[PDB]
Design a protein around this ligand. Structure first.
Ligand code: SF4
Ligand code: F3S
Ligand code: FES
Lengths: 114, 102, 99, 102, 83, 279, 44, 75, 217, 42, 64
């Protein structure tokens, strides 16, 4: 055990450290959310302008140019990347350590292919 | 009072009639009688630890001379087992989480 | 139930005469209370008469229920319609409580 | 089921070391902690503008990292002795004070 | 009691490295919350896979960091692939 | 109907009479004060315009024997004949002249009026009892209380002699001594706090002492029956050993001690109902 | 304490005499049940 | 009286059954058995709780009308 | 801790944020004093011995943890505007009633209890009864209303949830004002080319799901 | 002959004490009144 | 009474079957998902993920 004053000081220091980590995370999340919102707005405007997506109030339907959509291209590229790199993904039934090893191998392979 | 004394008397008569009807209606009356018997059994025959040992010790059953000790031992064993189980569960949860933290 | 009605009547009579009853102090009883007391006295007389076949039961009833009647009678002055209210009680049952 | 659940699981040794380092930091970098608390006390720096208090938070975090390092040989020895005493606890105030004076 | 309260308070602290610095910790927190375009398609699969592998905050953080790094690499590849 | 008016009158009437707690009417008009002052409670509930009207009378103390009853008679024979009082023995033996003599419930016959001409003396009825006339209380509730106690010798079995006196040693007759001297003055009962709260449900100190005397009779074989009849509800449980019964007893009795004995018997009877009833 | 409180109520409060002993016995049982329930709830 | 506070059990409530003493061993056994099920659930729930935030535990809120919960900038 | 009453906000570009800062600075001192009192009480209880402390704590110190949390939440959000409460009524009605019974914003008399008591007085004047009995009956419904009103501790949880929602809404709104000038250029073109009142956050979720559903891949 | 009269007396006294402790919170007091009249640490 | 209870259970089962048929039709209304090469080599169909592809049309290559 220790003194109650020392316990209070340690609690204050730990709370301060936690608050600093929360502030760092909040700043990172705010910057990322602002960037993501700008990118989403730009993508929606480009899609609507190109005649690829028709927005109707709250529902959106594929348009005539839906094949040239950047979102469709991104989905196809993500599928290709997952197939070529994350072969065992959604099917790797190993433990937490096995999954971590597979993820590390996939990340290393992606960096090698980068 | 006044002509409203008729209203007061009528209200009294209506309340008395309602009380009599609710009391003397077969199903509710049987249920109330059963509930009264159950309440008498619960209150008058409550599980007290102390009771009249009127009979002589040569006729006293050993279950009564050991009832207090048995009850106290059961309560103490339950408390100790609960504390031990809580400590063991906390330690096992800590260990399992540390293994799973990896 | 009869004894409780008599006791409630007695408690109503005593309630307006208590020293702590500053809420309402009426010297003369209301006509409702007098009529209720008269009806209760008639009922008590009839019930006591019906208890003639059992002398012990009749004596017990006169001792128990009649005590409240004597208490009420002593709590009310014998003026005006008081004899009209106490006509039934003040025949034999009055002397039982030395009245 | 009323106490708050634990989010990040640390071992007993890690908790004792973190407590000792937090005591050392509160006894050493209290100025940095106060600066961080004051910068993170207003509504703006608390929720609206988190980027403003970034410098003070970084200073406090660097101070905490240096304190928990215990690079000095005397500090390391004192921390090891205090950790041994705390583990023996499964008292120690003198060892804690000796570690603090280092 | 006091030790239990201290442990409960310390439970919310992320266990970073002792030798690591404030700048490195902040960069790692920034890398975790990294803005990527192709992540939207990768995030769904990553979360679906990690839903059965997340029981502790530390494991969740590790898996999320790995997923975020992979997503950033994939976003860089996508940016290099389609001008 | 008359509820609001009654409430207003009772609130105001009590408010308008709180300051004037003593009307203190004067019998006549006088200036020189060579006579003692007596405030006699006058309450004639026969005419509608009549209420407690305690009158201040002045008369020479030496004009009559220094007795409360004698002074009351002198005032009621010469000054104010309208006053009424019950008194027959005039020797403190019948309990008839029990009155509130200077803040105490005592028989007026065996009493002494104050000789301090400066200090006026106030005499009123028995207290918490229906007042039939000025200083005349009605013991109708008390008298019925004597009927409930069954104050008669009850024999479960007869004596074999059939021609002589019941065998009673002097000590056994002494067990009833000091309880048979009660004059039934109802002074102890009138000052009993238990009867002041529950006059109907409580027999009273005098009734309890009479019941104890009847139960403790050597010849009577209904002591258990007397205990059973007494140990019902708050008939005896109302008494809380306050002690005003013995201090207000003009006969020198110990109603508090009699009540203590009766309560001890009742409590032992409850134990005897369990100790002596098992098989 | 319950019997003493009941006696005190029946002594000072004249209005307390309007309730019969059957209700008082139900009142005492209800008070005992409430006390037991409160004792259990404070520990549960 | 003037002193009624006693520590003895109630003479009316100190009764005993015709089959022996008061039914206490069975009642105590039932109480202990019920406690095991009762104070086995809170122990399981309290000691097996983990706090995890993964950006998916949050879900788009909806009003009591079921529509997506959105508040205008100027209310 | 001792935040200055004077806020350095511009008050000419982000008025909502300026008002929020002014409100936070206004009520910071009293809230801090109350929080300090509660924390001192908690520390003293922790310093207790056996049944008087350190044994039933913080389990028996339940009313103090919630009070401290509520005080902290009230310190974080300066002043609650009545207009914003009604928006929270979209999720939970009677939020204003819960806040009034929890934050002591105004006087809380037993209105329904007073009406019930006056109702019994009408019967008291019809079937003639003592005025003391009439007053007792009038107090009894009022007393029941007061008892049912005070002590509402779940209302404190509801108010905590409302305060958290309001804090989140204010944080989001303040962020909108800061980037309003920057996002002004995109807003006009987005409104011109996208006839949609729903948020783009859910709209993007629709487009992503549609692409994952029906796309040439 | 009341069996375990000491046990009954102890149970009654303990029940009274527990009822007083739980209903009045005498052992768990609030020191916020003396909080202003205190010396702050740190 | 037993027959009435069985009939009520059967009616509830019929309603549930109708709901499930509507859900399955909606799921099958999606276009076919190709599974060739590695997609066929390591199909995403998993026991924990089976609920994510029930009545979902795929076109997988393989050797029977
Ligand atoms: S016991 Fe004494 S005071 Fe009481 S009635 Fe008899 S003589 Fe009077
Ligand atoms: S004052 Fe009452 S307590 Fe008894 S002896 Fe007297 S009746
Ligand atoms: S005249 Fe009888 S005692 Fe006074």
């Amino acid at each position: 055990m220790f003194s109650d004053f020392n316990m209070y000081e340690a609690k204050v220091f730990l709370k301060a450290v936690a608050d600093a980590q929360n502030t760092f995370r909040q700043t990172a999340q705010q910057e990322n959310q602002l960037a993501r919102y700008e990118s989403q707005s730009q993508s929606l405007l480009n899609g609507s302008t190109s005649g690829a997506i028709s927005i109707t109030g709250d529902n959106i339907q594929q348009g005539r140019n839906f094949k040239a959509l950047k979102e469709v291209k991104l989905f196809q590229y993500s599928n290709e990347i997952f197939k070529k790199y994350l072969a065992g993904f959604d099917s790797f039934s190993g433990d937490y350590t096995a999954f971590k090893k597979f993820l590390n191998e996939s990340v290393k392979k992606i960096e090698q292919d980068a | 009072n006044h002509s409203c004394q008729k209203v007061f008397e009528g209200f009294v008569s209506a309340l008395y009639d309602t009380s009599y009807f609710f009391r003397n209606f077969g199903p509710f009356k049987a249920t109330i009688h059963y509930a009264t018997y159950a309440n008498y059994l619960a209150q008058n025959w409550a599980p007290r630890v102390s009771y009249i040992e009127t009979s002589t010790p040569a006729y006293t059953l050993a279950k009564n001379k050991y009832a207090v000790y048995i009850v106290y031992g059961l309560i103490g064993g339950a408390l100790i087992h609960n504390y031990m189980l809580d400590n063991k569960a906390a330690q096992k949860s800590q260990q399992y989480y540390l293994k799973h933290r990896d | 139930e009869f004894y409780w009605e008599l006791k409630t009547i007695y408690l109503e009579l005593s309630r307006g005469v208590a020293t702590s009853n500053f809420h309402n102090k009426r010297e003369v009883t209301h006509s409702i209370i007098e009529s209720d007391i008269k009806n209760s006295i008639h009922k008590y007389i009839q019930l006591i008469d019906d208890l003639k076949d059992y002398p012990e039961w009749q004596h017990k009833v006169r001792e128990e229920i009649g005590y409240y009647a004597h208490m009420i009678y002593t709590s009310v002055n014998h003026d005006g319609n008081f004899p009209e209210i106490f006509k039934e009680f003040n025949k034999v049952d009055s002397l039982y409580y030395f009245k | 089921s009323i106490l708050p659940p634990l989010q990040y699981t640390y071992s007993n040794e890690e908790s004792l070391e973190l407590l000792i380092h937090s005591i050392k930091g509160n006894k050493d970098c209290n100025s940095e902690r106060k600066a961080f608390n004051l910068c993170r006390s207003t509504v703006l720096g608390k929720h609206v503008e988190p980027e403003k208090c970034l410098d003070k938070a970084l200073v406090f975090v660097n101070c905490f990292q240096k304190v928990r390092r215990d690079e000095s040989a005397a500090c390391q020895s004192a921390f090891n002795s205090t950790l041994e005493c705390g583990k023996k606890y499964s008292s120690c105030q003198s060892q804690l004070d000796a570690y603090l004076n280092c | 009691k006091l030790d239990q309260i201290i442990s409960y308070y310390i439970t919310p602290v992320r266990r970073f490295d002792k030798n690591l610095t404030a700048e490195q910790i902040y960069e790692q927190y920034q890398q975790a919350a990294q803005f990527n375009e192709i992540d939207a398609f990768t995030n769904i699969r990553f979360h679906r896979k990690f839903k059965e592998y997340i029981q502790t905050q530390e494991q969740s953080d590790y898996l999320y960091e790995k997923a975020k790094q992979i997503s950033t690499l994939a976003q860089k590849m996508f940016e290099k692939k389609f001008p | 109907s008359i509820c609001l008016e009654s409430i207003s009158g009772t609130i105001k009437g009590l408010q308008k009479a709180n300051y004037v707690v003593e009307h203190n009417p004067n019998l006549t008009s006088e200036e020189k004060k060579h006579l003692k002052q007596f405030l006699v409670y006058r309450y004639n509930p026969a005419d509608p315009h009549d209420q407690p009207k305690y009158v201040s009378y002045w008369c020479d103390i030496k004009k009559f024997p220094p007795m409360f009853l004698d002074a009351i008679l002198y005032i009621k024979n010469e000054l104010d004949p309208t006053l009424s009082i019950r008194r027959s023995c005039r020797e403190g033996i019948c309990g008839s002249c029990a009155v509130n003599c200077d803040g105490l419930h005592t028989l007026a016959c065996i009493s002494g009026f104050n000789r301090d001409l400066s200090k006026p003396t106030i005499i009123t009825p028995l207290g918490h009892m229906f007042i039939l006339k000025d200083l005349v209380v009605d013991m109708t509730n008390f008298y019925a209380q004597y009927k409930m106690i069954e104050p008669y010798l009850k024999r479960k079995t007869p004596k074999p002699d059939a021609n002589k006196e019941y065998p009673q040693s002097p000590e056994q007759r002494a067990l009833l001594d000091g309880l048979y001297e009660c004059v039934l003055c109802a002074a102890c009962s009138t000052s009993c706090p238990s009867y002041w709260w529950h006059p109907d449900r409580y027999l009273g100190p005098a009734i309890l002492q009479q019941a104890y005397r009847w139960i403790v009779d050597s010849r009577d074989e209904y002591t258990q029956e007397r205990i059973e009849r007494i140990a019902e509800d708050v008939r005896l449980d109302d008494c809380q050993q306050i002690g005003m019964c013995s201090f207000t007893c003009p006969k020198g009795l110990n109603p508090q001690l009699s009540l203590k004995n009766l309560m001890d018997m009742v409590k032992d009877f409850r134990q005897k109902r369990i100790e002596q009833e098992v098989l | 304490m319950f019997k003493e409180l009941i006696h005190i109520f029946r002594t000072y409060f004249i209005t307390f005499r309007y309730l019969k002993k059957s209700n008082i016995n139900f009142l005492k049982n209800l008070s005992y049940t409430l006390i037991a329930y409160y004792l259990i709830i404070n520990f549960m | 009286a003037r002193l009624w506070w006693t520590l003895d059990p109630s003479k009316y409530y100190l009764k005993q059954i015709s089959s022996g003493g008061r039914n206490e061993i069975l009642f105590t056994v039932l109480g202990v058995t019920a406690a095991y099920w009762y104070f086995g659930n809170k122990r399981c729930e309290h000691y097996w709780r983990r706090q995890i935030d993964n950006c998916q535990s949050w879900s788009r809120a909806q009003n009591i009308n079921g529509n997506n919960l959105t508040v205008k900038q100027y209310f | 801790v001792r935040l200055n009453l004077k806020s350095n906000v511009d008050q000419n570009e982000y008025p909502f944020l300026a008002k929020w800062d002014k409100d936070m600075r206004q009520n910071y001192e009293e809230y801090q004093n109350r929080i300090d009192a509660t924390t001192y009480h908690l520390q003293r209880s922790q310093r207790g011995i056996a049944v008087f402390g350190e044994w039933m704590y913080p389990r028996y110190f339940q009313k103090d943890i919630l009070e401290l949390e509520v005080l902290r939440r009230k310190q974080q959000l300066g002043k609650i505007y009545p207009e914003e409460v009604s928006s929270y009524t979209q999720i939970n009605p009677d939020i204003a009633n819960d806040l009034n019974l929890t934050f002591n914003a105004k006087l809380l008399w037993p209105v329904r209890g007073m009406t019930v008591g006056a109702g019994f007085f009408a019967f008291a004047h019809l079937f003639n009864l003592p005025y003391s009995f009439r007053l007792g009956l009038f107090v009894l419904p009022t007393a029941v209303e007061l008892a049912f009103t005070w002590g509402n501790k779940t209302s404190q949880f509801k108010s905590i949830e409302f305060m958290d929602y309001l804090l989140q809404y204010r944080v989001s709104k303040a962020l909108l004002e800061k980037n309003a000038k920057h996002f002004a250029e995109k807003k006009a073109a987005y409104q011109k080319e996208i006839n949609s009142s729903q948020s783009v956050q859910d709209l993007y979720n629709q487009l992503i799901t549609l692409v994952s559903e029906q796309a040439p891949s | 002959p009341i069996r375990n009269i000491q046990f009954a007396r102890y149970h009654y006294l303990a029940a009274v004490t527990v009822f007083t402790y739980f209903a009045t919170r005498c052992c768990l007091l609030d020191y916020k009144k003396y909080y202003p009249l205190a010396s702050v640490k740190k | 009474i037993g027959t009435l209870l069985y009939g009520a259970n059967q009616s509830s089962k019929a309603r549930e079957n109708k709901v499930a048929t509507e859900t399955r039709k909606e799921r099958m209304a999606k276009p076919t998902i190709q599974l060739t090469g590695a997609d066929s080599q390591n199909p995403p169909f998993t026991e924990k993920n089976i609920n994510d592809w029930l009545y979902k049309t795929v076109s997988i290559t393989g050797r029977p």
